[PDB]
Amino acid sequence: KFMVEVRIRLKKGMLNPEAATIERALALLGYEVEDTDTTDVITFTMDEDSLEAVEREVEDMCQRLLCNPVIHDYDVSINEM
Amino acid sequence: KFMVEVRIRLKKGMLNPEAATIERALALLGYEVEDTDTTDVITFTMDEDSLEAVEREVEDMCQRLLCNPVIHDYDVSINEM
């Protein structure tokens, strides 16, 4: 019924070990790239009675499982199938 | 009080995207390595009344949060501080 997509990205100012690791590795391989960042996208279908219930529920999953709002900025898009 | 360490590794036969990614990258950089694997270790202190409670609790955390026993083999070591 509902196609959900959650995008998770560390807030500005927050250290990104992977981003820093990739950037340095690239520099060493001879590639000059700046402002390297990483986003994690979780997609998944869900059955519900309404778009409203999916919203409050997905929001719950993000708060207690998918990410740490303290350090992560997240996006949630719900597309009805 | 208790120093806990949880080691998590995919069961034999299970695809390891990272392990496969690292191995191929290395081969390309000129390094011939075989049987590449990865282990995730989570360590953390915890206050308790007993070593027994920590054991049943840590076991719970692994079952519903730290890993997927279906595809992961895990180790749990508890050292009293």
Swiss-Prot record, chains A, B:
Its EC number is 6.3.5.3. One of its GO terms (cellular component) is cytoplasm. InterPro entries: PurS, PurS-like_sf. Keywords: ATP-binding, Cytoplasm, Ligase, Nucleotide-binding, Purine biosynthesis. Homodimer. Part of the FGAM synthase complex composed of 1 PurL, 1 PurQ and 2 PurS subunits. Part of the phosphoribosylformylglycinamidine synthase complex involved in the purines biosynthetic pathway. Catalyzes the ATP-dependent conversion of formylglycinamide ribonucleotide (FGAR) and glutamine to yield formylglycinamidine ribonucleotide (FGAM) and glutamate. The FGAM synthase complex is composed of three subunits. PurQ produces an ammonia molecule by converting glutamine to glutamate. PurL transfers the ammonia molecule to FGAR to form FGAM in an ATP-dependent manner. This is Phosphoribosylformylglycinamidine synthase subunit PurS.
